[PDB]
């Protein structure tokens, strides 16, 4: 009853859940 | 690698999308509705992996092509909504809004919270990238914002709503929809943002938050935002549009603490009481009372501060006079001057008597009667030195209290005339510092004529320029501006090289402080002065204008001016500039310190000498080792100018702290420099500042919550630092009285509680370091002196104070809802 | 001739977030030759 | 020569992804660009000593001065054990050479030609702190008392060194933080280094012992020498039990060398003047009483396991950055009377986040926390006590 | 060589008996620790593990 993450799954995890300024914040940091 | 149910759902979705792609054109609606049901049912769940979105990601292009090639109608939008919600995951050319616009335009709540957040972000992107044209296209992107803002409000995303609205640049729906519980978040959010946001958005946010406060009648907060704004008009409006008198009394306390004084007509409930409060006539009595509490009503002598016993020719006497005045400032009693100051003044010689007598006023600060009584005897001496020093003493005494009577005006306009000699600098400086915030056209018209009369040497001209500029600080007064411009034009081409010309641009910039396009125009007019002094005046006016704004581009320009090799008055000024621009927002202060360190490393002596002044200005009366150790390290520098500047910066940063490990360092510095008389004078002045008011005053031009920039205190600090920009001539010489410019900034660090009768309310309070909220409880009983960076909160709910910015004179309400 | 020298140009300014907002707010070649009687000729 | 401190950028207050933090970071970056541009621009803007250099040996060596004699002769160690009766040139400062200084010698004649005051052993230089850990006191849940004592021992003696003087009481120059395996002993040192203006110096007892001859004692000498040259300073010795265990009669040579280095340390702990020392230790009984003698280690701070309130505070501190679900209730995990360190709580939070990610949900929950607690802890019979 | 190239803590070669820095050797890596690094990956695979 344990699964392995998929490339699309992880891409959705990265993008879907994030405030709109996450990428800019990381870039500036 | 996919579960059985996952593959079954994938097959279902693939069959549905194949049906959509097929040109059946008769069963599109059921399939689209089924897709909508699945997608929204998956999305609304707290799971962060919407399976329909993951599965339909690859078919994004095919779905887009089908939508483009399908017949226009209801189905167009009925599939466009799905296309947008799917495009949320994968983007790169700003398509989600492009497809939502032609969409069902249904309520923006069925699609979870992440769709709303992405919507907000992308609409912010569109508004940011759009130009002044396409206003028709900006119209549709407003109803969605109006729907989103209440959504965020309900769902606790107040920060997201405030952000989105800021990026939209139309902060109206915010204050339209704010509720009772939303201030503790949105108001603080806006107040924090204003520091970093640039103009005109700074003023926009300030006025928006002021309107928010007015909405539910947060009068003190609205007044604080008005004070933030450099306009003493909304302040009067907010004070007038009030119904409670206790809140008006507290607002009057805070206004008097600030440099604004409002001249109303006899219509308010208690005009006499409110004007007396705003004038702070009782300030001397309150200070004496706080002295009685935690009894410190014992003047100490210069040798007492020096402590030379453990471990008199020309300059040490002056230093002793200065330190005595500093330590006994505003306490009235003195054990060396008040007892018998005549012999002290006489044993003082040369130009010393001026400052030696002005120390009398410094001691009798805010006490008109006592100052007059103790100064009348010395007011009549054969030498005009003592007379001018007495005039300075009276001016200092009047400074800080806005009494409707003007004994200072009468006495000092009696002498404003040169009287056949140039020794009226004392009268002019006294009048200025006495009426700093008054901005009375009477004093302006008294000062401006004498400023140019063919007999006002550059010394008098600079003194009166400082005086008038600090009278009309930050007001862009046309008369003062024009007269100063004319005098600067017509002074000369050679004498300008000699010092004391540094003060005319100071007057200009200080009058135009915090203005902007006003100084742009004044510079455009002032571009015709000369080669050496024109850059100096330009930079000085520019900094005096954008003091505290934190304008990164301007401080970049000033940094370029510093960097350019001059083989450097303007170069030195630009260092204090950087300091003054960074003097506000906390975050930039440390980076300004880093810049100062790098300048002291890779800098010529000219700006090396200015850097310590920048350090003192950036951390005034906030002694921290981060700066103190650097100043100590560079105190032993070979350059005497750098050593003197560093020592005085130590004194300022330690002003009104009595800090140990700083008094000891000053004592060691004096021990090492005993053979150097100028450096001995400097270290003695540093000790005097450190013990200033025996730890009862601060020079910080920031009172409310370290956020409200006090115009008069900034004026005093900047004039003093510009005077020291060349310590050797201005101060280490004839015109050492320039030190007394500190009065404009000197201000007690107290916390006095009152009932609704202007009567003290001794109540226990908790004080400690701010956490941005209180740490390290050090509770005591009011009134209690508060150290820099330490805030105070009531230890009990026994009362209902009128301010969340509890500090200084605070009225306490005895109205707890439930005790 | 001596090639004088190169003046130290100030490096490019610093690009910041609000810089963009501020900017938005604001021959004959003769084909013959003559040679006097003393004729230095290759 | 004053302190050295540790460069650190300001702290952005909002931990959430918001425009306050974005603008703060943008301003930080603006000022960094300013620093870089100023540098670039400045370094773009810009006989007798030659014969001094010529007379000075070309590959001149670095040695140590010993027992200065005369006004022109001195004994110098070559830095290989041997020593020579060398001469002194007029070039050196003079009135500045003292025993133990790192002088410069002409290679061939071996004659004193320089002083090289800043000579620091690469080991000491690297163990010196340049960055600053971003763990302020706010990140420490509970341990309020321990924070109070550490501040009184290393912070108050610098910010307000008048209270001690008023009553003629010398400050404690040594604080040993002793406790079980993980309770915040290193966190408190991290926070002190972050928030203090003094030159911090990380060291681990297992680092001071070198192999070649007396380099161990020499390195201790160098470490405390630099800690004196800079002031105020705080020397944090982690797991001192590496050196300092019960001194015993040695049966070999390596053990004798270890005891010699420990004795050298104890000797250097009698060089007052303001160099605070913070020892850390998991097991304090093994330490020699001489070290824990109440004249070199003034304070002993016990770091006990966290109580219910402390565990609660730790949980909020370490979950503040986590998108906690409304369903969670942070009392059952805490008050279950089982051993739980702060490190254990961090592990619980990390494993709970990983469990939620495995379940494909970004929001942790009560079942996720329970599974995390079950799977993180590794290690009285039932019924015997009720 | 350049000073900005011989920034601290980098192995550098020195000419004999003159000690004239003339190269930038690769950063020091202790022998008996350099060989503690898998250069040839073993042939095992997750497919060789059951249960
Ligand atoms: N009081 C605390 N507050 C916050 N985090 C804590 C606390 N105590 C422990 N931690 C967590 O544990 C680690 C800090 O423990 P630290 O390294 O200071 O322990 P220690 O006493 O040095 O341990 P050991 O004896 O195992 O070396 C970090 O992961 C920190 O998150």
Coordinates of N, CA, C and O in Angstrom, one line a residue, chain B residues 259-335:
Chain B
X259 N 6.5 67.4 15.8 CA 6.7 68.8 15.6 C 5.6 69.6 15.1 O 5.7 70.9 14.9
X260 N 4.4 69.0 14.8 CA 3.3 69.7 14.3 C 2.5 70.4 15.4 O 2.3 69.8 16.5
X261 N 2.2 71.7 15.2 CA 1.3 72.4 16.1 C 0.1 73.0 15.3 O 0.4 73.7 14.2
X262 N -1.1 72.8 15.7 CA -2.3 73.2 14.9 C -2.9 74.4 15.6 O -3.2 74.4 16.8
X263 N -3.1 75.4 14.8 CA -3.7 76.7 15.3 C -5.2 76.7 14.9 O -5.6 77.1 13.8
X264 N -6.0 76.2 15.8 CA -7.4 76.1 15.6 C -8.1 77.4 16.1 O -7.5 78.3 16.7
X265 N -9.4 77.5 15.8 CA -10.3 78.6 16.3 C -11.0 78.1 17.6 O -11.1 76.9 17.9
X266 N -11.5 79.1 18.3 CA -12.2 78.8 19.6 C -13.5 78.1 19.4 O -14.6 78.8 19.6
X267 N -13.5 76.9 18.9 CA -14.7 76.1 18.7 C -14.7 74.7 19.4 O -15.8 74.2 19.6
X268 N -13.5 74.1 19.6 CA -13.4 72.8 20.2 C -13.9 72.8 21.6 O -14.1 73.9 22.2
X269 N -14.2 71.6 22.1 CA -14.7 71.5 23.5 C -13.9 72.3 24.5 O -14.3 73.3 25.1
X270 N -12.6 71.9 24.6 CA -11.7 72.5 25.6 C -10.5 73.0 24.7 O -9.4 72.3 24.6
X271 N -10.6 74.2 24.2 CA -9.6 74.8 23.3 C -8.3 75.1 24.2 O -7.2 74.7 23.8
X272 N -8.5 75.7 25.3 CA -7.4 76.1 26.2 C -6.6 74.8 26.6 O -5.4 74.8 26.5
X273 N -7.4 73.8 27.1 CA -6.7 72.6 27.5 C -6.0 71.9 26.4 O -4.9 71.4 26.6
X274 N -6.6 71.7 25.2 CA -6.0 71.0 24.1 C -4.8 71.8 23.6 O -3.8 71.2 23.3
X275 N -4.9 73.1 23.5 CA -3.7 73.9 23.1 C -2.6 73.8 24.1 O -1.4 73.7 23.7
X276 N -2.9 73.9 25.4 CA -1.9 73.7 26.4 C -1.2 72.3 26.3 O 0.0 72.2 26.4
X277 N -2.0 71.3 26.1 CA -1.4 69.9 25.9 C -0.5 69.9 24.7 O 0.6 69.4 24.8
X278 N -1.0 70.4 23.6 CA -0.2 70.4 22.4 C 1.1 71.2 22.5 O 2.1 71.0 21.9
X279 N 1.1 72.2 23.4 CA 2.3 73.0 23.6 C 3.2 72.4 24.7 O 4.4 72.7 24.7
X280 N 2.7 71.4 25.4 CA 3.5 70.7 26.4 C 4.2 71.6 27.4 O 5.3 71.5 27.8
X281 N 3.4 72.6 27.9 CA 3.9 73.6 28.9 C 4.3 72.8 30.1 O 5.3 73.1 30.8
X282 N 3.4 71.8 30.5 CA 3.7 71.0 31.7 C 4.8 70.0 31.5 O 5.1 69.2 32.4
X283 N 5.5 70.1 30.4 CA 6.6 69.1 30.1 C 7.7 69.2 31.2 O 8.2 68.2 31.6
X284 N 8.1 70.4 31.6 CA 9.1 70.6 32.6 C 8.7 70.0 33.9 O 9.5 69.3 34.5
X285 N 7.5 70.2 34.3 CA 7.0 69.7 35.6 C 6.9 68.2 35.5 O 7.3 67.5 36.5
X286 N 6.5 67.6 34.4 CA 6.5 66.1 34.3 C 7.9 65.6 34.3 O 8.1 64.5 34.9
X287 N 8.8 66.2 33.6 CA 10.2 65.7 33.7 C 10.8 65.8 35.1 O 11.4 64.8 35.5
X288 N 10.5 66.9 35.8 CA 10.9 66.9 37.2 C 10.3 65.8 38.0 O 11.0 65.2 38.9
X289 N 9.0 65.6 37.8 CA 8.3 64.5 38.6 C 9.0 63.2 38.3 O 9.2 62.4 39.2
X290 N 9.2 62.9 37.0 CA 9.9 61.6 36.7 C 11.3 61.5 37.3 O 11.8 60.5 37.7
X291 N 11.9 62.7 37.4 CA 13.2 62.7 38.1 C 13.0 62.3 39.6 O 13.8 61.6 40.2
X292 N 12.0 62.9 40.2 CA 11.7 62.5 41.6 C 11.5 61.0 41.8 O 12.1 60.4 42.7
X293 N 10.7 60.4 40.9 CA 10.6 59.0 40.9 C 11.9 58.4 40.4 O 12.5 58.9 39.4
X294 N 12.4 57.4 41.0 CA 13.8 56.9 40.8 C 14.8 58.1 40.9 O 15.4 58.5 40.0
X295 N 14.8 58.6 42.1 CA 15.4 59.9 42.4 C 16.8 60.0 41.7 O 17.7 59.3 42.1
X296 N 16.9 60.9 40.8 CA 18.2 61.3 40.2 C 18.3 62.8 40.2 O 19.1 63.4 39.4
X297 N 17.7 63.5 41.2 CA 17.7 64.9 41.3 C 19.0 65.4 42.0 O 18.9 66.1 43.0
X298 N 20.1 64.9 41.5 CA 21.4 65.3 42.0 C 22.4 65.6 40.9 O 23.0 64.7 40.3
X299 N 22.6 66.9 40.6 CA 23.6 67.2 39.5 C 25.0 66.6 39.8 O 25.4 66.6 41.0
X300 N 25.7 66.2 38.8 CA 27.0 65.7 38.9 C 28.0 66.6 38.1 O 27.6 67.3 37.2
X301 N 29.2 66.6 38.6 CA 30.2 67.6 38.0 C 31.1 66.9 37.0 O 31.3 65.7 37.0
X302 N 31.8 67.7 36.2 CA 32.6 67.1 35.1 C 33.7 66.2 35.6 O 33.9 65.1 35.0
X303 N 34.3 66.5 36.8 CA 35.2 65.5 37.3 C 34.5 64.3 37.8 O 35.1 63.2 37.7
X304 N 33.3 64.4 38.3 CA 32.5 63.2 38.6 C 32.4 62.3 37.4 O 32.5 61.1 37.5
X305 N 32.0 62.8 36.3 CA 31.8 62.0 35.1 C 33.2 61.5 34.7 O 33.3 60.3 34.3
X306 N 34.2 62.3 34.7 CA 35.6 61.9 34.2 C 36.1 60.7 35.0 O 36.7 59.8 34.4
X307 N 36.0 60.8 36.3 CA 36.5 59.7 37.2 C 38.0 59.6 37.0 O 38.5 58.4 37.0
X308 N 38.7 60.7 36.9 CA 40.1 60.6 36.7 C 40.8 60.3 38.0 O 41.9 59.7 38.0
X309 N 40.2 60.5 39.2 CA 40.9 60.2 40.4 C 41.2 58.8 40.6 O 42.3 58.4 41.0
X310 N 40.3 57.9 40.2 CA 40.6 56.4 40.2 C 41.4 56.1 39.0 O 42.0 57.0 38.3
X311 N 41.6 54.8 38.7 CA 42.5 54.3 37.6 C 43.8 55.2 37.5 O 44.7 54.8 36.8
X312 N 43.6 73.2 32.7 CA 42.7 74.3 33.0 C 43.0 75.5 32.2 O 42.6 76.6 32.6
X313 N 43.7 75.4 31.1 CA 44.2 76.5 30.4 C 43.2 77.1 29.4 O 42.7 78.2 29.6
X314 N 42.8 76.3 28.4 CA 42.0 76.9 27.3 C 40.9 76.0 26.8 O 39.9 76.6 26.2
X315 N 40.9 74.7 26.9 CA 39.9 73.8 26.2 C 39.3 72.9 27.2 O 38.1 72.5 27.0
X316 N 40.0 72.4 28.2 CA 39.4 71.6 29.2 C 38.3 72.3 30.0 O 37.4 71.6 30.4
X317 N 38.4 73.6 30.2 CA 37.4 74.3 30.9 C 36.1 74.3 30.0 O 35.0 74.0 30.5
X318 N 36.2 74.5 28.7 CA 35.1 74.4 27.8 C 34.5 73.0 27.8 O 33.3 72.9 27.8
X319 N 35.3 72.0 27.8 CA 34.8 70.6 27.8 C 34.1 70.4 29.1 O 33.0 69.7 29.1
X320 N 34.6 70.8 30.3 CA 33.9 70.6 31.5 C 32.6 71.3 31.5 O 31.6 70.8 32.0
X321 N 32.5 72.6 31.0 CA 31.2 73.3 30.9 C 30.2 72.5 30.0 O 29.1 72.3 30.4
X322 N 30.7 72.0 28.9 CA 29.8 71.2 28.0 C 29.3 70.0 28.7 O 28.1 69.7 28.6
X323 N 30.2 69.2 29.3 CA 29.7 67.9 29.9 C 28.8 68.2 31.1 O 27.8 67.5 31.3
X324 N 29.1 69.3 31.9 CA 28.2 69.6 33.0 C 26.8 70.0 32.5 O 25.8 69.5 33.0
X325 N 26.7 70.8 31.4 CA 25.5 71.1 30.8 C 24.7 69.9 30.3 O 23.5 69.8 30.5
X326 N 25.5 69.0 29.6 CA 24.8 67.8 29.1 C 24.2 67.0 30.2 O 23.1 66.5 30.1
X327 N 25.0 66.7 31.2 CA 24.6 65.8 32.3 C 23.4 66.4 33.1 O 22.5 65.7 33.5
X328 N 23.4 67.7 33.3 CA 22.4 68.4 34.1 C 21.3 69.0 33.2 O 20.5 69.8 33.6
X329 N 21.3 68.6 31.9 CA 20.3 69.2 31.0 C 18.9 68.9 31.4 O 18.5 67.8 31.8
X330 N 18.0 70.0 31.4 CA 16.6 69.9 31.7 C 16.3 69.6 33.2 O 15.1 69.6 33.6
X331 N 17.3 69.3 34.0 CA 17.1 69.1 35.4 C 17.1 70.4 36.3 O 16.8 70.3 37.5
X332 N 17.4 71.5 35.7 CA 17.3 72.8 36.3 C 18.5 73.0 37.3 O 19.3 73.9 37.0
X333 N 18.6 72.3 38.4 CA 19.6 72.5 39.3 C 21.0 72.1 38.7 O 21.1 71.1 38.0
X334 N 22.0 72.9 39.0 CA 23.4 72.5 38.7 C 24.3 72.9 39.9 O 24.0 73.9 40.6
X335 N 25.3 72.1 40.0 CA 26.2 72.2 41.2 C 27.4 73.0 40.9 O 28.3 73.2 41.8

